[PDB]
Amino acid sequence: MKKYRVQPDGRFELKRFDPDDTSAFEGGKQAALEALAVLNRRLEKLQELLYAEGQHKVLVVLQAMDAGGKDGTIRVVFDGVNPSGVRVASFGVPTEQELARDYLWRVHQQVPRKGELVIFDRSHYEDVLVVRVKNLVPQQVWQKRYRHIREFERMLADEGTTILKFFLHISKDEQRQRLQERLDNPEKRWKFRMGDLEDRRLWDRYQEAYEAAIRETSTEYAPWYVIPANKNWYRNWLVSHILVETLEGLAMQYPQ
Amino acid sequence: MKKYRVQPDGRFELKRFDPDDTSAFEGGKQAALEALAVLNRRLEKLQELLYAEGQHKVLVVLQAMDAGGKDGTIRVVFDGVNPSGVRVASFGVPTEQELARDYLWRVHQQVPRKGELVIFDRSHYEDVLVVRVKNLVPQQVWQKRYRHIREFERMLADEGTTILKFFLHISKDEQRQRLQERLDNEKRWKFRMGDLEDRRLWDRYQEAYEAAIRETSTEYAPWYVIPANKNWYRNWLVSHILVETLEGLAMQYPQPEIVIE
Amino acid sequence: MKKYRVQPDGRFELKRFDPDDTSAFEGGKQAALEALAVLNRRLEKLQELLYAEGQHKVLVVLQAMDAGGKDGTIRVVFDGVNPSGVRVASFGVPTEQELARDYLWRVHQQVPRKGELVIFDRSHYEDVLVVRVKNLVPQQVWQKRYRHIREFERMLADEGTTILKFFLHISKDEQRQRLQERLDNPEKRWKFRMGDLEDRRLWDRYQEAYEAAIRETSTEYAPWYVIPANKNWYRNWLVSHILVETLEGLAMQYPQPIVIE
Amino acid sequence: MKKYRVQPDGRFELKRFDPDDTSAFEGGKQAALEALAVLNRRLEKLQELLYAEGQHKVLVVLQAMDAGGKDGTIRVVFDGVNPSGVRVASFGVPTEQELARDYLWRVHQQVPRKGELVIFDRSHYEDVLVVRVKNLVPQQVWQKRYRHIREFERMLADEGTTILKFFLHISKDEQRQRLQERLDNPEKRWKFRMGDLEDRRLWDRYQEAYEAAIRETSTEYAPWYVIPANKNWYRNWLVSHILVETLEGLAMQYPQPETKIVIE
Ligand SMILES: Nc1ncnc2c1ncn2[C@@H]1O[C@H](COP(=O)(O)OP(=O)(O)OP(=O)(O)O)[C@@H](O)[C@H]1O
Ligand SMILES: Nc1ncnc2c1ncn2[C@@H]1O[C@H](COP(=O)(O)OP(=O)(O)OP(=O)(O)O)[C@@H](O)[C@H]1O
Ligand SMILES: Nc1ncnc2c1ncn2[C@@H]1O[C@H](COP(=O)(O)OP(=O)(O)OP(=O)(O)O)[C@@H](O)[C@H]1O
Ligand SMILES: Nc1ncnc2c1ncn2[C@@H]1O[C@H](COP(=O)(O)OP(=O)(O)OP(=O)(O)O)[C@@H](O)[C@H]1O
């Protein structure tokens, strides 16, 4: 339900959300997997509607601590959706070309067009996250970006983009296990890079940056949802539920 | 299977391929779906390898007569593939922006990067198909493009791109039936009036497809003629050809350079 | 002389600016040409500094009624500037690709990078100008865009873009002569577009739209300048003066730092 | 005018071109400057036709040894050209995003459109130059690229692009002065890199790559011109002459009006 939408009152505190919380689903993994299968099928039908109607633009932003489940959320929640109408835009270390323009330039280029659903795998929020945590620009610079982001998203929404932002929220010990497993798994070693450790040493700074970002930019037109993500089955189910409910609210119809 | 690969001998004749041929699968519809499901899961694992290895580029080109099943092929063959590694680039009627540059400009911009598999829903070949059939440029112009394409694809492959080109081959009457289907129903939005103009030109299109295939099917960028009158056979055959191709790359997960605290 | 900078008090009135005003220059065309040549030489040197320092981004927006002199301003004001560091981005009728995204998508793509000076030949302001005058989207939509533009420009400025916006202001009788000239000159007829006459019939609505846009979006970090433009020599001189002074105000420095055998 | 167009016979030899050659212009520095001014103004006027006609695409390639004068040529040759029709595309060290595609991806994106003149400040040729000299890919890789480039440029020309490729040819001792003068000038030190020295130490391997590239890719649809570039006034004059005449050969026309009538 909507106990996970962050209200636009600037009173948000990340400690009020428990990464192991599963209270929204009355059951465990096995029943959730079945309910996910039902939601996934509705998602597929709604996506085909979105694409066919060709009017709405849908933007899903995914942010998380490292190993917080971004890849799994993309892979599982959107399984079976027509590839012609869903696109993943990943944002990594900015290139020199990208740093030569404002930080929103490379992000604005990737926004979804009419009839399209786009997933931001990481996003412009990295410019008030990692950029803040590692002081890649002075605080006086990034402090102003919360306003930039609110106004950029307001413009997107005003012009027809439905915006969903999900913070996949895992605990510190959960990250330790996933990072270790990533080491203890030959098919996952490629995902692990030593830089992952340095980011972990800053666990508390990142959590502070995430709370500030979420408090500052969760709006009626661009809400943040905090997703307890220690349980993959719960994470996938809750994201699917919110996404499906949002898409249903658009009242999309096939053209005559 | 390889009897469906157009050899680079310039002696391709499209009549030597039956739109209803299914001789490559020993069974019927139901047995094929079982093998297709097996191939699909094979496809998924190979995509995750491709993405993880981050070395090869894979370009799948889809061409067919209208209603020849390209949209269905994309939706069925790549069901369940991780969206982060599979991308569809569709090419429609060129804009003024795209016509102000060479015809390959808009196509080159969309090629797959390392670790990525890209589906061309239509391709640069439209510039030696519809462009030729409707004489949108003089033959003196487009007849040169067979070489451009051979060389453009040669450069892509030399630099690491695996190229598969599939012609989904249906019969004319089969087309009529499917077109009539499009009018009857949730799909009416897909139907176009220009489609009829193209239908009367069925023969000029078949000739262009044979010419393009004869001219541009190469060792580094082969054409496969896919009997596509049967969707279950079409999907199975394309899946089989692709999976073999990905298997031939012998891809391996990379390697690393210890206890997390 | 910042008598032409529109202050950010939302009080701007277009009627208080006379297109024939030349009061800022004590002289006429011949003396202005000499002052322009002096300013142009400084501009060329400041541009080389901008490029060499590689930190600031400079955006010059040009808007005007049709035949209001934007092409002439570009040609004359930027005569002799190194092509490696200045670039014109012109905005015409949005394509379907561009209309499928928010109106700022196609504009953001063209903003200047570090060390570069970009001229917007027309700009995002068309989306509260022609779009407003001809109701290309409902008033409920475009009325919201003044805020979008204020915040878009604020973000650009916060992140290092110096923004100058020039409204080249000609009178209605002046536009009649210049349009009539474009018809009577074989070297300019191609510039004449039949839509221009429709736009002329709406002269008053465009003036209203320009007044609203300028009142709504002239801010400290992104000022509008109203340029009396009936006199080309005065227009070119005044734009050069404002541009040069702005660039001088940035106080740009060449970057910091053995024999060759 | 005729003697600087590398013939498409694959026997091109660089040592048969003198960086100090000025034999194409009858005069000295001052007489060339006057002719350069005359060519410059025709260039301005021809560009306005190109832009207005909106049919032809014009691509000017500039390659040179470091400090060989590519920046100066752009600054001088195109001084006074309307920015609305002339665009410079610079190519530096590829980003990871650009390396994830074939080396021609980032270059093809920048080709000129109809009515436009584009200057490639460095180009796709760097992928058989610095890439070859420093073995950024195995010779097995970059050896195939001469073919790629001939065919890429053939496609461009067939589809309406006029291609001019200029190698600005300076001597090893001449480069030494410009690099030195680059240090001895507070307004130019920013241009000097230490990598400039490591590339200078490889002068001969670079010269060999240029001869190979020029011999392999000079064709009748995409000619290379070797420009004696030790003297700036001659370099600027010669490049201007070749460019202007080529533009004259296009026989560009102002369009016909839309459709005598009166304005109210
Ligand atoms: N604006 C930014 N400034 C600096 N670093 C950034 C920015 N945006 C993204 N990054 C960083 O880019 C890094 C790598 O992203 P990339 O997708 O290229 O690699 P990856 O191995 O797939 O990582 P992941 O799956 O965690 O995104 C991340 O650590 C992220 O913090
Ligand atoms: N280079 C080209 N020049 C002219 N027409 C082209 C070109 N490329 C594709 N086309 C034509 O444009 C149409 C494809 O446009 P688009 O992708 O918008 O179609 P659609 O309505 O989605 O359906 P479909 O693509 O399946 O036919 C086809 O009729 C094709 O022949
Ligand atoms: N956002 C927009 N919405 C609608 N029309 C627009 C928009 N932006 C620009 N235009 C229109 O585009 C036209 C300019 O087109 P373009 O620049 O391609 O041609 P042009 O002949 O050079 O015209 P001009 O010299 O007046 O700019 C103008 O009529 C202008 O009103
Ligand atoms: N394909 C390529 N592979 C490797 N290096 C390349 C490639 N293309 C260009 N470069 C190199 O990029 C370097 C930097 O050029 P850049 O345009 O970024 O800036 P610059 O300092 O102004 O250089 P310059 O004035 O010498 O052109 C040059 O040394 C050039 O050789």
Proportion of β residues of chain A?
5-15%
Q: Supply the number of helical segments of chain A.
A: 11
Number of strands of chain A: 5
Named at the architecture level, the CATH assignment of chain A is 3-Layer(aba) Sandwich
The computed structural class of chain A is: alpha/beta
Please tell me how large the radius of gyration of chain A is: 18 Å
From N to C, what is the helix and strand string of chain A?
A: HEHEHHEHHHEHHHEH
CATH topology of chain A: Rossmann fold
Main attributes of the structure:
homotetramer; 256 residues; alpha/beta; Rossmann fold; five-stranded parallel sheet; 5 strands; binds adenosine-5'-triphosphate
Summarize the structure.
Four copies of one chain form a homotetramer. Chain A has 256 residues and is α/β, with parallel strands linked by helices.
Question: What does this protein structure show overall?
Answer:
Four copies of one chain form a homotetramer. The first copy, chain A, is of the alpha/beta class and 256 residues long. Chain A has one domain: P-loop containing nucleotide triphosphate hydrolases (Rossmann fold, 3-Layer(aba) Sandwich). Helices cover 45% and strands 12% of the residues of chain A. In chain A, strands 2-3-1-4-5 form a five-stranded parallel beta sheet, with helices on both faces. In chain A, helix 1 runs parallel beside helix 11 (232-249) and helix 2 (70-77) packs across helix 11. The longest helix of chain A has 25 residues, at 29-53. The C-D interface holds C 52, 71, 74-75, 78-84, 86-88, 90, 119, 121, 176, 179-180, 183, 186-187, 189-194, 197, 200, 254-255, 257-261 and D 52, 71, 74-75, 78-84, 86-88, 90, 119, 121, 176, 179-180, 183, 186-187, 189-191, 197, 200, 254-258, 260-264. Bound molecules: adenosine-5'-triphosphate (4 copies). The PDB classes it as transferase. The entry lists the keywords Polyphosphate Kinase type 2 class III, transferase. It forms a tetrameric assembly. Structure of Polyphosphate Kinase from Meiothermus ruber N121D bound to ATP. Chains A, B, C, D: Polyphosphate:AMP phosphotransferase.
